[PDB]
Amino acid sequence: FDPTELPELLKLYYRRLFPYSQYYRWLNYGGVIKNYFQHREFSFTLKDDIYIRYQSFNNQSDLEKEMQAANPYKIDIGAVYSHRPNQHNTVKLGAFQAQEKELVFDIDMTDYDDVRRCCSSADICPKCWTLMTMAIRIIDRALKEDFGFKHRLWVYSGRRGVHCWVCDESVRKLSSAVRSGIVEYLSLVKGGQDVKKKVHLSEKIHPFIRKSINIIKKYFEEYALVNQDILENKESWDKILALVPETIHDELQQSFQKSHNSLQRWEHLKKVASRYQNNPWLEWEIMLQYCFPRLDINVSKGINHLLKSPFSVHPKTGRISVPIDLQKVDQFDPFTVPTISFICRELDAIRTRDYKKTSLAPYVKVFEHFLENLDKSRKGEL
Numbered sequence: 001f002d003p004t005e006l007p008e009l010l011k012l013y014y015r016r017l018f019p020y021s022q023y024y025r026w027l028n029y030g031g032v033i034k035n036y037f038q039h040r041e042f043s044f045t046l047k048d049d050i051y052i053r054y055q056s057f058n059n060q061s062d063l064e065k066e067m068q069a070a071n072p073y074k075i076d077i078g079a080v081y082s083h084r085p086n087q088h089n090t091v092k093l094g095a096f097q098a099q100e101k102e103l104v105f106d107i108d109m110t111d112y113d114d115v116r117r118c119c120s121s122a123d124i125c126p127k128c129w130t131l132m133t134m135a136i137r138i139i140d141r142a143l144k145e146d147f148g149f150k151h152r153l154w155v156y157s158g159r160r161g162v163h164c165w166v167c168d169e170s171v172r173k174l175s176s177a178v179r180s181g182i183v184e185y186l187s188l189v190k191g192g193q194d195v196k197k198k199v200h201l202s203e204k205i206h207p208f209i210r211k212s213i214n215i216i217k218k219y220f221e222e223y224a225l226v227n228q229d230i231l232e233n234k235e236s237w238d239k240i241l242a243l244v245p246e247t248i249h250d251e252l253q254q255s256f257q258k259s260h261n262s263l264q265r266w267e268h269l270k271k272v273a274s275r276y277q278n279n280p281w282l283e284w285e286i287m288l289q290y291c292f293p294r295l296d297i298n299v300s301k302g303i304n305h306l307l308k309s310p311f312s313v314h315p316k317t318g319r320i321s322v323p324i325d326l327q328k329v330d331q332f333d334p335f336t337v338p339t340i341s342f343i344c345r346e347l348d349a350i351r352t353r354d355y356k357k358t359s360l361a362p363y364v365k366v367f368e369h370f371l372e373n374l375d376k377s378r379k380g381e382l
């Protein structure tokens, strides 16, 4: 992919590929509440790194114009305000307020750099992507089952991770305090680089952790013991030994040297830690530290937070921020996600269903299934 064709590719994309219809269907929420789409903040990042927010629109047409006209590199979605963002200059200090917004989560592979061995920073590969699978599975389960949120849109961020948009009517009205509280409930891995052991479990395990461990259990062997090989050598297993009491280090160090692979060594860790319990949950704290999701509290705390819009274009990778099918989450592949050059290539190889002919279609379907279930809820149908 070439980032210089981008300003040219965007023009075509924003005119004949971006699904404005389903897009407006989303943000207007069946017209039930007036000025809802009209008070929504957007932000655009043009060429030269020009950044502008407080963008508002009257309707889907007004949106289509201003975007094709601006032709932005980045499109961020903000809150629904007390007034029109466009006229914020006209609003008195104290009356311009962010009032409603979807509950949002940002999950970055980069935050796993201390527990993955294949990549670092903004690099991802198939060996470490499993972390996102476990993140989605773990968190979506909590949002669905523990919190009863019914309309959840998971989106690939374009490069390093996934976003989740929780759009239930009752959810969009949550105070910043409750939003912050949801993050605390979902969060287990605490500490910065200064902190070696980032997970501590009580004698009594809250169901959320239990169910979270059990999802991780399902992936741990292939991800951690095979792909990551977290016990390959001494340089690596010392990191694991740092997470368990010193009184078992020597016994384990020897067992690790006499074993051949991580599967053997992990099983040794399991037996030794277990004995240690008898006279607390070392095995699980290690799995949680290596596989449990890391969440940026700041993204989800603030109601006025601007998050990268679905179907945006990643300026460097060229990938489309595409919706993720929750039923096919283990099958999701960030490396086969259509790039803008690819869906423009396909459109140049053939008026409202032009996108259905491109590789972008199945993802728009998912967004539609997301939209359909919203309508039914507003109506009453299950």
Ligand SMILES: O=c1ccn([C@@H]2O[C@H](COP(=O)(O)OP(=O)(O)OP(=O)(O)O)[C@@H](O)[C@H]2O)c(=O)[nH]1
Residues within 6 Å of the ligand: 076, 106, 107, 108, 157, 158, 159, 160, 161, 299, 305, 306, 307, 308
């Ligand atoms: O000043 C701001 C305000 C808000 N944001 C918003 O915070 C979100 C945090 O997200 P990230 O900055 O971690 O990047 P990303 O998820 O959009 O995509 P990746 O490259 O990581 O895969 C971003 O998506 C952006 O919308 C900022 O980045 N800067």
Ligand SMILES: [Mg+2]
Residues within 6 Å of the ligand: 106, 107, 108, 157, 160, 161, 162
């Ligand atoms: Mg991100």
Ligand SMILES: [Mg+2]
Residues within 6 Å of the ligand: 106, 108, 296, 299
């Ligand atoms: Mg972040």
Ligand SMILES: [Zn+2]
Residues within 6 Å of the ligand: 116, 118, 119, 123, 124, 125, 126, 127, 128, 129
């Ligand atoms: Zn990797």
